[PDB]
């Protein structure tokens, strides 16, 4: 199995985000999201699956942060500017069907950042980026 | 908008279930799961969508509990005996594609129960069963 432990850092008091959805894709015997010590922990049955956290702020901003393992290496991606019909489960499945999302997954990124239309930055960085016990920060700007 | 507030009752010390996935279907402008006072609260943009909670016990048992609104009336359904590739996001989408699941949604039930293969009962009962502020108990046997 693979585990990814996520710590969320909110750095900007002009908004407050909280998780509103946590999904697990069906490959590699699936997996589970849990919480330990305020950390989001994704356990997966093997390489080749992922899980998505969707976050929402009361000002309307939202994004997905997806974490997984592709070909035995971690990957991540962030999607911002979500439409109301782009729920977390929609986004999570797209990584295994929609070519641009497949390509983002297959890049096996251990670090990625992107801005939304309002100019807020979002970053995922794996601080332990090797092996089966992976650790990442999700940093909201 | 519609809100469904879920209280989980565990009655049998031979197992301990905990939530491992929470999904929101894409219709009706989607929605959000949050937690308040240990209750799982699903807010939806309108009638016509739903969300799924998946629970797992360390003895291997697992199930989904899905809650939604169909033509302004609440509905619910439970699926047990989950295979590893039947994650919550898989099950949630089936209510809009797979005949037996669609029919369960269309029943617009205020209460539903089913047993798994090991004989454990699972029940949903809406204790506030009309209008836009809905409340349900999920009772695990």
mmCIF file of C-alpha atoms in Angstrom:
data_model
loop_
_atom_site.group_PDB
_atom_site.id
_atom_site.type_symbol
_atom_site.label_atom_id
_atom_site.label_comp_id
_atom_site.label_asym_id
_atom_site.label_seq_id
_atom_site.Cartn_x
_atom_site.Cartn_y
_atom_site.Cartn_z
ATOM 1 C CA UNK A 1 0.000 0.000 0.000
ATOM 2 C CA UNK A 2 0.841 3.688 -0.307
ATOM 3 C CA UNK A 3 0.010 6.403 2.208
ATOM 4 C CA UNK A 4 -0.055 10.162 1.657
ATOM 5 C CA UNK A 5 -0.311 12.428 4.713
ATOM 6 C CA UNK A 6 -1.425 15.995 3.967
ATOM 7 C CA UNK A 7 -0.956 19.049 6.195
ATOM 8 C CA UNK A 8 -2.951 22.136 5.239
ATOM 9 C CA UNK A 9 -1.391 25.581 5.769
ATOM 10 C CA UNK A 10 -3.635 28.628 5.374
ATOM 11 C CA UNK A 11 -1.500 31.660 5.194
ATOM 12 C CA UNK A 12 -3.909 34.460 4.209
ATOM 13 C CA UNK A 13 -6.518 35.764 6.656
ATOM 14 C CA UNK A 14 -8.561 37.316 3.829
ATOM 15 C CA UNK A 15 -10.302 33.950 3.339
ATOM 16 C CA UNK A 16 -10.898 30.658 5.151
ATOM 17 C CA UNK A 17 -11.095 27.377 3.253
ATOM 18 C CA UNK A 18 -12.338 24.053 4.572
ATOM 19 C CA UNK A 19 -12.683 20.602 3.012
ATOM 20 C CA UNK A 20 -16.083 19.836 1.513
ATOM 21 C CA UNK A 21 -15.455 16.544 -0.319
ATOM 22 C CA UNK A 22 -12.953 13.688 -0.128
ATOM 23 C CA UNK A 23 -13.006 11.066 -2.893
ATOM 24 C CA UNK A 24 -11.078 7.885 -3.695
ATOM 25 C CA UNK A 25 -10.628 6.483 -7.189
ATOM 26 C CA UNK A 26 -11.405 2.824 -7.796
ATOM 27 C CA UNK A 27 -8.108 1.464 -9.189
ATOM 28 C CA UNK A 28 -5.476 -0.385 -7.159
ATOM 29 C CA UNK A 29 -8.056 -1.752 -4.708
ATOM 30 C CA UNK A 30 -9.219 1.747 -3.844
ATOM 31 C CA UNK A 31 -8.360 3.300 -0.527
ATOM 32 C CA UNK A 32 -9.584 5.459 2.296
ATOM 33 C CA UNK A 33 -9.307 9.058 3.613
ATOM 34 C CA UNK A 34 -9.031 9.546 7.373
ATOM 35 C CA UNK A 35 -7.902 12.237 9.779
ATOM 36 C CA UNK A 36 -5.163 11.963 12.369
ATOM 37 C CA UNK A 37 -3.907 14.964 14.369
ATOM 38 C CA UNK A 38 -5.704 17.376 11.932
ATOM 39 C CA UNK A 39 -3.866 15.776 8.950
ATOM 40 C CA UNK A 40 -5.681 14.244 5.983
ATOM 41 C CA UNK A 41 -4.358 10.745 5.396
ATOM 42 C CA UNK A 42 -4.989 8.871 2.145
ATOM 43 C CA UNK A 43 -4.204 5.148 2.088
ATOM 44 C CA UNK A 44 -4.318 3.345 -1.272
ATOM 45 C CA UNK A 45 -4.109 -0.344 -2.058
ATOM 46 C CA UNK A 46 -1.195 0.012 -4.473
ATOM 47 C CA UNK A 47 0.161 2.242 -7.228
ATOM 48 C CA UNK A 48 -2.241 3.618 -9.799
ATOM 49 C CA UNK A 49 -4.988 5.392 -7.888
ATOM 50 C CA UNK A 50 -5.560 8.701 -6.112
ATOM 51 C CA UNK A 51 -7.917 10.749 -4.011
ATOM 52 C CA UNK A 52 -9.235 14.288 -4.275
ATOM 53 C CA UNK A 53 -9.859 16.873 -1.569
ATOM 54 C CA UNK A 54 -12.158 19.725 -2.563
ATOM 55 C CA UNK A 55 -11.971 22.944 -0.529
ATOM 56 C CA UNK A 56 -14.397 25.845 -0.420
ATOM 57 C CA UNK A 57 -14.189 29.324 1.151
ATOM 58 C CA UNK A 58 -17.275 31.292 2.251
ATOM 59 C CA UNK A 59 -16.318 33.987 -0.305
ATOM 60 C CA UNK A 60 -17.045 31.482 -3.109
ATOM 61 C CA UNK A 61 -13.493 30.436 -4.004
ATOM 62 C CA UNK A 62 -12.826 26.733 -4.362
ATOM 63 C CA UNK A 63 -10.277 24.259 -5.641
ATOM 64 C CA UNK A 64 -9.373 20.594 -5.762
ATOM 65 C CA UNK A 65 -6.118 19.074 -4.535
ATOM 66 C CA UNK A 66 -5.538 15.557 -5.835
ATOM 67 C CA UNK A 67 -2.858 13.212 -4.520
ATOM 68 C CA UNK A 68 -1.916 9.771 -5.768
ATOM 69 C CA UNK A 69 0.725 7.347 -6.971
ATOM 70 C CA UNK A 70 1.453 6.761 -10.656
ATOM 71 C CA UNK A 71 4.011 4.145 -11.685
ATOM 72 C CA UNK A 72 5.283 3.919 -8.092
ATOM 73 C CA UNK A 73 5.942 7.683 -7.762
ATOM 74 C CA UNK A 74 3.767 10.312 -6.167
ATOM 75 C CA UNK A 75 1.757 12.757 -8.192
ATOM 76 C CA UNK A 76 -0.418 15.778 -7.480
ATOM 77 C CA UNK A 77 -2.494 18.382 -9.238
ATOM 78 C CA UNK A 78 -4.609 21.427 -8.343
ATOM 79 C CA UNK A 79 -7.687 22.595 -10.268
ATOM 80 C CA UNK A 80 -9.072 26.054 -9.499
ATOM 81 C CA UNK A 81 -11.987 28.198 -10.676
ATOM 82 C CA UNK A 82 -14.382 25.259 -10.222
ATOM 83 C CA UNK A 83 -17.814 25.444 -11.754
ATOM 84 C CA UNK A 84 -20.695 24.268 -9.530
ATOM 85 C CA UNK A 85 -20.900 21.006 -11.560
ATOM 86 C CA UNK A 86 -17.189 20.239 -11.134
ATOM 87 C CA UNK A 87 -17.422 18.437 -7.838
ATOM 88 C CA UNK A 88 -14.475 16.517 -6.408
ATOM 89 C CA UNK A 89 -15.746 13.192 -7.670
ATOM 90 C CA UNK A 90 -16.022 14.648 -11.194
ATOM 91 C CA UNK A 91 -12.472 15.952 -11.108
ATOM 92 C CA UNK A 92 -11.007 12.783 -9.568
ATOM 93 C CA UNK A 93 -12.406 10.592 -12.368
ATOM 94 C CA UNK A 94 -11.152 12.945 -15.096
ATOM 95 C CA UNK A 95 -7.560 11.976 -14.265
ATOM 96 C CA UNK A 96 -8.324 8.536 -15.755
ATOM 97 C CA UNK A 97 -10.330 9.629 -18.811
ATOM 98 C CA UNK A 98 -9.561 13.188 -19.953
ATOM 99 C CA UNK A 99 -6.203 13.452 -21.747
ATOM 100 C CA UNK A 100 -5.010 16.740 -20.234
ATOM 101 C CA UNK A 101 -5.711 15.423 -16.736
ATOM 102 C CA UNK A 102 -4.099 12.048 -17.516
ATOM 103 C CA UNK A 103 -0.987 13.933 -18.622
ATOM 104 C CA UNK A 104 -0.948 16.000 -15.410
ATOM 105 C CA UNK A 105 -1.076 12.780 -13.378
ATOM 106 C CA UNK A 106 1.590 11.011 -15.431
ATOM 107 C CA UNK A 107 4.045 13.880 -14.825
ATOM 108 C CA UNK A 108 4.458 12.484 -11.279
ATOM 109 C CA UNK A 109 4.933 15.922 -9.789
ATOM 110 C CA UNK A 110 6.184 16.224 -6.233
ATOM 111 C CA UNK A 111 5.549 19.991 -6.299
ATOM 112 C CA UNK A 112 2.964 22.094 -8.109
ATOM 113 C CA UNK A 113 1.432 25.526 -7.731
ATOM 114 C CA UNK A 114 -1.203 27.450 -9.626
ATOM 115 C CA UNK A 115 -3.302 30.601 -9.214
ATOM 116 C CA UNK A 116 -7.034 31.107 -9.514
ATOM 117 C CA UNK A 117 -8.666 33.967 -11.424
ATOM 118 C CA UNK A 118 -8.656 36.167 -8.300
ATOM 119 C CA UNK A 119 -4.886 35.707 -8.089
ATOM 120 C CA UNK A 120 -4.697 33.417 -5.057
ATOM 121 C CA UNK A 121 -1.850 30.879 -5.106
ATOM 122 C CA UNK A 122 -2.275 27.217 -4.161
ATOM 123 C CA UNK A 123 0.685 24.838 -3.752
ATOM 124 C CA UNK A 124 1.282 21.183 -3.029
ATOM 125 C CA UNK A 125 4.793 20.171 -2.032
ATOM 126 C CA UNK A 126 5.821 16.697 -0.951
ATOM 127 C CA UNK A 127 8.293 17.068 1.897
ATOM 128 C CA UNK A 128 8.804 13.282 1.884
ATOM 129 C CA UNK A 129 8.560 12.458 -1.795
ATOM 130 C CA UNK A 130 9.971 8.900 -1.891
ATOM 131 C CA UNK A 131 8.713 5.449 -1.036
ATOM 132 C CA UNK A 132 5.411 4.272 0.364
ATOM 133 C CA UNK A 133 4.962 6.711 3.273
ATOM 134 C CA UNK A 134 4.613 10.079 1.556
ATOM 135 C CA UNK A 135 4.099 13.490 3.206
ATOM 136 C CA UNK A 136 2.842 16.679 1.591
ATOM 137 C CA UNK A 137 1.948 20.227 2.486
ATOM 138 C CA UNK A 138 -1.013 21.966 0.869
ATOM 139 C CA UNK A 139 -0.286 25.683 1.166
ATOM 140 C CA UNK A 140 -3.052 28.193 0.489
ATOM 141 C CA UNK A 141 -2.032 31.776 -0.346
ATOM 142 C CA UNK B 1 -30.951 24.862 -1.450
ATOM 143 C CA UNK B 2 -31.448 21.680 0.564
ATOM 144 C CA UNK B 3 -29.559 20.537 3.661
ATOM 145 C CA UNK B 4 -29.338 17.030 5.116
ATOM 146 C CA UNK B 5 -27.819 16.678 8.608
ATOM 147 C CA UNK B 6 -26.702 13.133 9.475
ATOM 148 C CA UNK B 7 -26.140 11.692 12.962
ATOM 149 C CA UNK B 8 -24.349 8.332 13.155
ATOM 150 C CA UNK B 9 -25.360 5.862 15.868
ATOM 151 C CA UNK B 10 -23.155 2.795 16.439
ATOM 152 C CA UNK B 11 -24.819 0.219 18.603
ATOM 153 C CA UNK B 12 -22.606 -2.918 18.398
ATOM 154 C CA UNK B 13 -19.172 -3.062 20.097
ATOM 155 C CA UNK B 14 -18.059 -5.957 17.884
ATOM 156 C CA UNK B 15 -17.000 -3.372 15.271
ATOM 157 C CA UNK B 16 -16.150 0.305 14.918
ATOM 158 C CA UNK B 17 -16.965 2.080 11.660
ATOM 159 C CA UNK B 18 -15.601 5.436 10.572
ATOM 160 C CA UNK B 19 -16.084 7.535 7.475
ATOM 161 C CA UNK B 20 -13.483 7.133 4.752
ATOM 162 C CA UNK B 21 -14.988 9.047 1.803
ATOM 163 C CA UNK B 22 -17.578 11.775 1.258
ATOM 164 C CA UNK B 23 -18.720 12.603 -2.272
ATOM 165 C CA UNK B 24 -21.097 15.087 -3.892
ATOM 166 C CA UNK B 25 -22.878 14.487 -7.176
ATOM 167 C CA UNK B 26 -22.672 17.138 -9.885
ATOM 168 C CA UNK B 27 -26.340 17.952 -10.550
ATOM 169 C CA UNK B 28 -28.243 20.892 -9.051
ATOM 170 C CA UNK B 29 -25.117 23.022 -8.745
ATOM 171 C CA UNK B 30 -23.413 20.393 -6.593
ATOM 172 C CA UNK B 31 -22.964 20.921 -2.905
ATOM 173 C CA UNK B 32 -20.660 20.447 0.048
ATOM 174 C CA UNK B 33 -20.153 18.065 3.019
ATOM 175 C CA UNK B 34 -19.095 19.613 6.320
ATOM 176 C CA UNK B 35 -19.064 18.661 9.972
ATOM 177 C CA UNK B 36 -20.780 20.468 12.782
ATOM 178 C CA UNK B 37 -21.090 19.092 16.337
ATOM 179 C CA UNK B 38 -19.928 15.630 15.052
ATOM 180 C CA UNK B 39 -22.791 15.620 12.486
ATOM 181 C CA UNK B 40 -22.212 15.218 8.751
ATOM 182 C CA UNK B 41 -23.996 18.043 6.954
ATOM 183 C CA UNK B 42 -24.675 17.897 3.208
ATOM 184 C CA UNK B 43 -25.712 21.173 1.572
ATOM 185 C CA UNK B 44 -26.936 20.956 -2.025
ATOM 186 C CA UNK B 45 -27.563 23.731 -4.502
ATOM 187 C CA UNK B 46 -31.122 22.600 -5.211
ATOM 188 C CA UNK B 47 -33.244 19.512 -5.599
ATOM 189 C CA UNK B 48 -31.864 16.776 -7.829
ATOM 190 C CA UNK B 49 -28.506 15.775 -6.395
ATOM 191 C CA UNK B 50 -27.047 13.749 -3.525
ATOM 192 C CA UNK B 51 -23.936 12.809 -1.606
ATOM 193 C CA UNK B 52 -22.441 9.549 -0.406
ATOM 194 C CA UNK B 53 -20.676 8.671 2.840
ATOM 195 C CA UNK B 54 -18.562 5.508 2.801
ATOM 196 C CA UNK B 55 -17.749 3.823 6.106
ATOM 197 C CA UNK B 56 -15.179 1.159 6.868
ATOM 198 C CA UNK B 57 -14.589 -0.991 9.989
ATOM 199 C CA UNK B 58 -11.183 -2.436 10.862
ATOM 200 C CA UNK B 59 -12.751 -5.929 10.641
ATOM 201 C CA UNK B 60 -13.196 -5.335 6.890
ATOM 202 C CA UNK B 61 -16.896 -4.520 6.740
ATOM 203 C CA UNK B 62 -17.909 -1.466 4.741
ATOM 204 C CA UNK B 63 -20.959 0.255 3.321
ATOM 205 C CA UNK B 64 -22.196 3.418 1.704
ATOM 206 C CA UNK B 65 -25.005 5.681 2.899
ATOM 207 C CA UNK B 66 -26.348 8.052 0.246
ATOM 208 C CA UNK B 67 -28.672 10.970 0.916
ATOM 209 C CA UNK B 68 -30.309 13.333 -1.558
ATOM 210 C CA UNK B 69 -33.384 15.118 -2.848
ATOM 211 C CA UNK B 70 -35.358 14.026 -5.911
ATOM 212 C CA UNK B 71 -38.239 16.219 -7.132
ATOM 213 C CA UNK B 72 -38.182 18.059 -3.801
ATOM 214 C CA UNK B 73 -38.512 14.895 -1.663
ATOM 215 C CA UNK B 74 -35.735 13.266 0.319
ATOM 216 C CA UNK B 75 -34.274 9.930 -0.592
ATOM 217 C CA UNK B 76 -31.723 7.534 0.821
ATOM 218 C CA UNK B 77 -30.061 4.202 0.109
ATOM 219 C CA UNK B 78 -27.464 1.892 1.631
ATOM 220 C CA UNK B 79 -25.110 -0.429 -0.273
ATOM 221 C CA UNK B 80 -23.231 -3.113 1.654
ATOM 222 C CA UNK B 81 -20.689 -5.822 0.865
ATOM 223 C CA UNK B 82 -18.546 -3.322 -1.064
ATOM 224 C CA UNK B 83 -15.771 -4.624 -3.281
ATOM 225 C CA UNK B 84 -12.460 -2.725 -3.164
ATOM 226 C CA UNK B 85 -13.301 -1.088 -6.519
ATOM 227 C CA UNK B 86 -16.702 0.133 -5.279
ATOM 228 C CA UNK B 87 -15.525 3.371 -3.748
ATOM 229 C CA UNK B 88 -17.994 6.037 -2.669
ATOM 230 C CA UNK B 89 -17.562 8.042 -5.852
ATOM 231 C CA UNK B 90 -18.365 4.917 -7.900
ATOM 232 C CA UNK B 91 -21.533 4.249 -5.916
ATOM 233 C CA UNK B 92 -22.728 7.878 -5.889
ATOM 234 C CA UNK B 93 -22.693 8.122 -9.700
ATOM 235 C CA UNK B 94 -24.604 4.838 -10.059
ATOM 236 C CA UNK B 95 -27.778 6.520 -8.733
ATOM 237 C CA UNK B 96 -27.941 8.401 -12.065
ATOM 238 C CA UNK B 97 -26.971 5.529 -14.371
ATOM 239 C CA UNK B 98 -27.700 2.035 -12.952
ATOM 240 C CA UNK B 99 -31.351 0.953 -12.980
ATOM 241 C CA UNK B 100 -31.644 -0.550 -9.494
ATOM 242 C CA UNK B 101 -29.889 2.448 -7.918
ATOM 243 C CA UNK B 102 -31.998 4.907 -9.943
ATOM 244 C CA UNK B 103 -35.120 3.127 -8.762
ATOM 245 C CA UNK B 104 -33.973 3.355 -5.132
ATOM 246 C CA UNK B 105 -33.532 7.118 -5.521
ATOM 247 C CA UNK B 106 -36.933 7.400 -7.191
ATOM 248 C CA UNK B 107 -38.599 5.725 -4.179
ATOM 249 C CA UNK B 108 -37.948 8.926 -2.242
ATOM 250 C CA UNK B 109 -37.640 7.017 1.041
ATOM 251 C CA UNK B 110 -37.750 8.645 4.458
ATOM 252 C CA UNK B 111 -36.286 5.427 5.869
ATOM 253 C CA UNK B 112 -34.439 2.393 4.539
ATOM 254 C CA UNK B 113 -32.632 -0.579 6.041
ATOM 255 C CA UNK B 114 -30.672 -3.522 4.775
ATOM 256 C CA UNK B 115 -28.388 -6.229 6.166
ATOM 257 C CA UNK B 116 -24.944 -7.179 4.895
ATOM 258 C CA UNK B 117 -23.791 -10.754 4.210
ATOM 259 C CA UNK B 118 -22.534 -11.108 7.793
ATOM 260 C CA UNK B 119 -26.021 -10.193 9.030
ATOM 261 C CA UNK B 120 -25.344 -6.679 10.352
ATOM 262 C CA UNK B 121 -28.252 -4.244 9.963
ATOM 263 C CA UNK B 122 -27.879 -0.677 8.688
ATOM 264 C CA UNK B 123 -30.750 1.842 8.743
ATOM 265 C CA UNK B 124 -31.382 5.427 7.736
ATOM 266 C CA UNK B 125 -34.324 7.264 9.350
ATOM 267 C CA UNK B 126 -35.148 10.886 8.554
ATOM 268 C CA UNK B 127 -36.329 12.460 11.827
ATOM 269 C CA UNK B 128 -36.968 15.755 10.009
ATOM 270 C CA UNK B 129 -38.362 14.366 6.798
ATOM 271 C CA UNK B 130 -39.980 17.261 4.931
ATOM 272 C CA UNK B 131 -38.929 20.656 3.625
ATOM 273 C CA UNK B 132 -35.470 21.994 2.936
ATOM 274 C CA UNK B 133 -33.825 21.358 6.329
ATOM 275 C CA UNK B 134 -33.712 17.589 6.587
ATOM 276 C CA UNK B 135 -32.253 15.480 9.400
ATOM 277 C CA UNK B 136 -31.435 11.773 9.394
ATOM 278 C CA UNK B 137 -30.073 9.123 11.706
ATOM 279 C CA UNK B 138 -27.726 6.465 10.333
ATOM 280 C CA UNK B 139 -28.007 3.536 12.749
ATOM 281 C CA UNK B 140 -25.424 0.771 12.550
ATOM 282 C CA UNK B 141 -26.292 -2.630 14.062
#
